[PDB]
Ligand binder design. Structure first.
Ligand SMILES: NC(=O)c1ccc[n+]([C@@H]2O[C@H](COP(=O)([O-])OP(=O)(O)OC[C@H]3O[C@@H](n4cnc5c(N)ncnc54)[C@H](O)[C@@H]3O)[C@@H](O)[C@H]2O)c1
Ligand SMILES: NC(=O)c1ccc[n+]([C@@H]2O[C@H](COP(=O)([O-])OP(=O)(O)OC[C@H]3O[C@@H](n4cnc5c(N)ncnc54)[C@H](O)[C@@H]3O)[C@@H](O)[C@H]2O)c1
Ligand SMILES: NC(=O)c1ccc[n+]([C@@H]2O[C@H](COP(=O)([O-])OP(=O)(O)OC[C@H]3O[C@@H](n4cnc5c(N)ncnc54)[C@H](O)[C@@H]3O)[C@@H](O)[C@H]2O)c1
Ligand SMILES: NC(=O)c1ccc[n+]([C@@H]2O[C@H](COP(=O)([O-])OP(=O)(O)OC[C@H]3O[C@@H](n4cnc5c(N)ncnc54)[C@H](O)[C@@H]3O)[C@@H](O)[C@H]2O)c1
Ligand SMILES: O=c1[nH]cnc2c1ncn2[C@@H]1O[C@H](COP(=O)(O)O)[C@@H](O)[C@H]1O
Ligand SMILES: O=c1[nH]cnc2c1ncn2[C@@H]1O[C@H](COP(=O)(O)O)[C@@H](O)[C@H]1O
Ligand SMILES: O=c1[nH]cnc2c1ncn2[C@@H]1O[C@H](COP(=O)(O)O)[C@@H](O)[C@H]1O
Ligand SMILES: O=c1[nH]cnc2c1ncn2[C@@H]1O[C@H](COP(=O)(O)O)[C@@H](O)[C@H]1O
Lengths: 389, 389, 389, 389
């Protein structure tokens, strides 16, 4: 019985798999599809799994999930639904300042019932729903920010492809002195050197990803960006040294990508395309080839840039369509159950525990070859029907 | 004279290829498609090749092949046919306890003739066919297990996606105390750390693979699993230290995948999709686009979970169809002859010899690039017809 | 302020140094002099440090220190003194069976006072001092073992240069069936492959080291042995999987070697030359060139083999002398204070905690070049006097 | 109990240490002092160890030991004694042809008794002692070789610092056509490329080492040679492909160097300095500072090149003295017992088995750091006396 004397509270666990530190040592360009998380020990049911998540230094959500500040994803209906599910939405800024402040006002005034329960409903002190908003880094964004702070916005995201700029750092120093209470997320960043300049400017969170988004062409136009899994791991590991949470933003096609982003050190995950074409996503449904579709586009797509408007405009995103997904109040419970089940197979009873296992090297990972990615999908069938829930 | 003095019973063999230990040192995600086994020396005919296989610590099969405990693969007709061919079948548990015990009873009472010959017919002491059954890890599975042990079941498989759980370890300790004679296979596991907890619980065999199965989506939903060749090699090497055989389960598309699974240290191989849509697989044939198909589905697909029905259910598998393959009594002889010719090209006269050559580093392997996998398949033709036998 | 959300109970610690696994990855021949342990965090005084140590599966000492079964180190006076200090002594077997049983009898009958205090005095259930004895693997050792078990010996060490033998495994099986209460330490071993056979034979502890001891010539005579730090790490890691403690035996010149041996996974440390030429070490003091010396010799030295006696005898050790060190009741408190201060600088409040930090990767090491070993000694002085306490 | 089914005749052995192939992969300059052989499993007594050794393609000695063709080591008294002990001696050629043929004649005419027993006495078909002789690669060496073959010499060594020459290859072709029965050892070589040219010329054995010998200065004069352990391993591995045995020549200070040389693939070991200053070594004893010494010198030392004398001669060796060792009939039994005990600790019951274990990867090695070489010698004593037997 005296095994406790020879190694204390450890006990022997066979070594198998790679720590996150080893998984990224090779300096390949790993994205979420390129690796798996190895199963752990299960000693809890999947419903016990705590999804409590830092959005910023001060704001805590009960679900890691965020709707992206895009004009085809997040206006007040999306922000209300995401808050009720225990995430948040950032109202997009491809609209007039007064329009965006009116969308924020609708979220802050919602009250519910003015039929279901929302035990994760992600409220502020006054029992109003939490709301985020995007702003740019121009001089008009100072006026927009006056209106949004008057409308009771809880958190601001500085909304750029490349947040490591004098323009953004000046905007951070301006917000943190004029509205010291206001939580500011800087971004986008993909390197620790970008993250250090915004953390030194005093941001309360970071938004991580460049390229990677489903509608994005920044990598093939600008040559610039990073494989998103590697960016999330590198920026989360840097931001963690300063107590700064990160949002893994863009490239999330599946529940398994969400679990990978959280496991690599993201505190929250931001989705455009996964929440696009829901009932709460702005714009109308339409039929093309007998499929109920809704528009979805990059904010640096030409039609997104033509709205509300150096002579030649470089596209950084595409405009397209996503098939109807139903309602956020149906889809986000599927994401929550999928995340909890993923955490349960991993043996983490909490997302804070999941990241603690990753940084301690208790959590183990495994690379996938191309043939392993084929083997991990559906293969060898004549036909099949992938109904996820 | 001098050769024996200078190096004993060795003699010089040029070094070429990698040992299994070197093949997996790189920590890539190798699956079966990612590597080849190098040819050895042939000094026997392929019909000399002994396919004798440990299923558990106590049970030996004269052939390595197992039918998977799936409701579209293994009821009594499959289990009878697989036993007569010298494998075994595990009766699925997506049915009431009395139905599954009646399927087991039909296997144990079969006798043959109540006409081919079955010199590998895989029988117990009383000359009844061997039968396996699946059970879960709930409290109803204790009653199910009582009925199955009354029906004379020879071996139990504990049937989970992630067998390293308190629920499963408790079910192992319960079976081994109440039914000490009964052989228990634990699983599914893909890591040695999972394998150690079930081997310490006292399982008699392990079932290896998570993801990998043709109908499986656990990797894209849960983020969790392993490339199956790597999982088989790692878990077989760990389980071997304790005298525990392993079943390589799922991702077997070809005879070459079976030979690879056995070469990597699997004692037996379990198939769903390769034995699905045979005459003995449960369910009816049907025609769609002029092809004779039969249903094949994951046990964690939604329509499989609906049978005999936490409000939102997460799919871990798809539902689909496989093209008709004929009869087990035709197809399993093709698998046996294919395994024997593979062993003959390798220079192993037995599967025990094959694994001994692998652990001693006598058996050599070679990685395949993507261009080598293309080169290894059919290429450069206008059209062709792949008639396998 | 929610830093706990982003990484749970870990918290950020800069990475510096190597884990023990990395320190031995290079496959150099590291001994204790070849590496340092890096300092940790101090949150306790050195006297709080708990030195409770497993000698075997069942026996616990309150100090990690053992006197070696050598005829110039351990008879009853050494064994009494080492037990009173909270270690143990193994009575040597280079004597008649009746003489060794009489030495053991003197330890078991001691009582104290028939005046310092001994709060670590390392007693049995009946409040007698613990005593070990050595035996060989011949047929006369069965009679010797009968006398020693009648004399009330608590633990047996099987005393060979190379314990992985049929002769030794047979002696283990013989002891464990005839004397099932009796604790057996196997050895000497230096590889996990040797440790496997003795652990499978059923030893309760292992003695680790071959060559390495101050009087050793086994390496330049037999070509056979291992660098002792590497042997301790590799055998302790293997033995830990089975709950078997290890004794790091030989090559301990300093307190820092003891702290290194314990950090590398040794449960206890065995000393010959460090405890030789104390007042309790057998044999007389003598003067040569004006220095008070006592004889110290290997048990495979020719004069040690000439005592109590294939015509040509191979020496495996030398015969020599050590300068007088005083008394065990003065020297072992210096070793204890040195071990506790080493643990305090490391940041481990217990030896069980120290090994837990090492296996978990929290304890970091650092290799020393030859120039770093020079820099870590006394250097650049005209003269100096190294008074240790 | 079917553990044989899962891995055949292998059985599980924990991997620990390096195979010889891995030990030399790093391309350091390992000599014998730089590595250890790890202990194996002992299932035999050391006297069972068979030391039967190929000298050439045709000649077998019962002991691996050869006296070097040096004028301070091997004339007829040494060659007789080495043959009676079950090695051989090569009579040196720093003499006139008639003198060397008379030394060979005395060995071939010896008979014994014209009283110990010599069960290893290393005779030819006619029950005469085996004798070797050296020759050079000049035209006078053709006449010398006529006389030596008339005197009944059994084996010739071609005696050069650098055997990969037109002069030596011509001499090999000349011997093999004029005396087809006569066994020829080529050398010295240290690379496989040198070995390939002499093996293609048709030598029956190789002599391996350049520098390394105790009296060597070839490395600091010529810049040319190899670390002897590495040379033995490389040349033995190459020569083994053709069934050619190797002599490891020079740098043998200890029994452990002999066991290392044999384990690295040497079939026999050649000694100068270890057999110098024995009673059978040519030259007289003399006293200097009260020590009974005998001269020992390199054959390329100036005073060795003066005997039997562009104009400037380069020393390749030193002239010196060795302390008296006694008689070959006392010392060679110590070498034999030391080799057998080293083999017993390693777990090889034969030298053919030892080399088979090394090439198959079963024999494991371990590098020594400088601090491990210190720890492996005598350390931490005031004084000591190293009596070897
Ligand atoms: N994450 C991505 O990979 C990514 C890539 C492209 C676009 N987007 C999104 O599309 C939208 C537009 O992105 P963007 O980066 O093109 O917008 P942006 O306004 O940040 O940048 C456009 C250009 O204006 C410059 N700029 C910004 N503020 C300035 C100031 N005060 N003075 C002078 N120049 C200034 C920028 O450096 C850049 O050259 C945002 O919603 C953004 O998140 C995201
Ligand atoms: N590739 C694979 O290995 C794989 C992947 C997915 C599903 N499957 C198969 O699909 C079927 C279902 O797999 P599964 O893992 O979903 O079934 P499962 O019943 O093992 O697990 C379902 C859930 O219930 C939990 N659970 C199990 N026993 C419990 C108990 N007593 N109390 C409380 N909670 C308990 C589990 O931890 C898990 O959260 C099986 O046939 C399985 O083999 C296999
Ligand atoms: N550093 C070390 O670990 C080391 C090295 C050398 C010696 N020593 C010590 O010196 C002493 C002698 O060591 P040793 O290994 O020479 O003693 P030993 O008795 O274990 O071995 C001596 C020889 O006898 C053989 N032998 C042992 N039992 C036998 C049996 N029943 N039948 C036949 N042969 C048998 C062994 O295999 C070996 O060849 C011990 O105190 C030992 O601990 C220790
Ligand atoms: N460690 C060693 O291997 C080593 C090193 C130096 C010397 N030695 C020994 O010292 C002795 C002398 O060695 P050596 O190599 O100096 O002797 P050597 O006669 O082989 O070489 C001396 C020189 O003469 C040349 N030579 C040889 N045969 C020739 C021919 N027919 N025509 C023209 N040139 C020819 C050689 O190439 C070399 O330049 C030998 O006993 C040898 O084994 C050994
Ligand atoms: O026009 C664009 N080009 C590049 N990236 C964009 C653009 N518009 C939005 N993004 C990014 O894409 C993310 C959404 O990606 P998705 O979830 O994969 O669809 C957003 O949150 C932005 O970071
Ligand atoms: O619903 C499911 N999801 C994931 N894996 C499954 C599911 N049902 C069965 N499996 C696994 O898939 C294996 C069969 O894989 P196949 O032989 O490649 O078709 C089974 O034996 C199970 O381990
Ligand atoms: O004759 C011998 N040769 C080699 N090792 C020995 C011999 N006798 C004892 N030993 C070992 O040396 C250890 C003591 O080493 P020391 O503490 O460094 O002096 C003992 O416990 C034995 O393992
Ligand atoms: O003059 C010389 N220089 C260098 N090596 C020599 C010389 N003479 C003999 N040797 C080598 O030294 C070996 C003996 O080395 P030892 O046994 O270490 O003393 C001989 O067999 C030769 O290969």
């Amino acid at each position: 019985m005296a095994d406790y004397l020879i190694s204390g509270g450890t006990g022997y666990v066979p070594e198998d798999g790679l720590t996150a530190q080893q998984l990224f040592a090779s300096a390949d360009g790993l994205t979420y599809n390129d690796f798996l998380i190895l199963p752990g020990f299960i000693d809890f049911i999947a419903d016990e799994v705590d999804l409590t998540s830092a959005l910023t230094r001060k704001i805590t959500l009960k679900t890691p999930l965020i709707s992206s500040p895009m004009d085809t994803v997040t206006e007040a209906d999306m922000a209300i639904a995401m808050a009720l599910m225990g995430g948040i939405g950032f109202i997009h800024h491809n609209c007039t300042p007064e329009f965006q402040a009116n969308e924020v006002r609708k979220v802050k005034k919602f009250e519910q019932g003015f039929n279901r329960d929302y035990p994760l409903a992600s409220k502020d002190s006054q029992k109003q729903l939490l709301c985020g908003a995007a702003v740019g880094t121009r001089e008009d964004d100072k006026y927009r920010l006056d209106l949004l702070t008057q409308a009771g916005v809880d958190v601001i995201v500085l909304d750029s492809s490349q947040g490591n700029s004098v323009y953004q750092i000046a905007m951070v120093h301006y917000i943190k002195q004029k509205y010291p209470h206001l939580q500011v997320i800087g971004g986008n960043v993909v390197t620790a050197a970008q993250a250090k300049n915004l953390i030194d400017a005093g941001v309360d969170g970071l938004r991580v990803g460049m390229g990677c988004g489903s509608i994005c062409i920044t990598q093939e136009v600008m040559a610039c960006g990073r494989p998103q899994g590697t960016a999330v791991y590198k920026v989360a590991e840097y931001a963690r040294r300063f107590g700064v949470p990160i949002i893994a933003d863009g490239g999330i096609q599946t529940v398994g990508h969400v679990v990978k982003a959280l496991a690599l050190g993201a505190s929250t995950v931001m989705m455009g395309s996964l929440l696009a074409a829901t009932t709460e996503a702005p714009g109308e449904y339409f039929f093309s080839d007998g499929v109920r579709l809704k528009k979805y586009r990059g904010m640096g797509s030409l039609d997104a840039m033509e709205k509300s408007s150096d002579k030649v405009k470089i596209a950084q995103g595409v405009s397209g369509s996503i098939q109807d997904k139903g309602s956020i109040q149906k889809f986000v419970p599927y994401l929550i159950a999928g995340i909890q089940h993923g955490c349960q197979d991993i043996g983490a009873r909490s997302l804070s525990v999941l990241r603690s296992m990753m940084y301690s090297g208790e959590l183990k990972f495994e690379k996938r070859t191309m043939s392993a990615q084929i083997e991990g999908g559906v293969h060898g069938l004549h036909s099949y029907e992938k109904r996820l829930y």
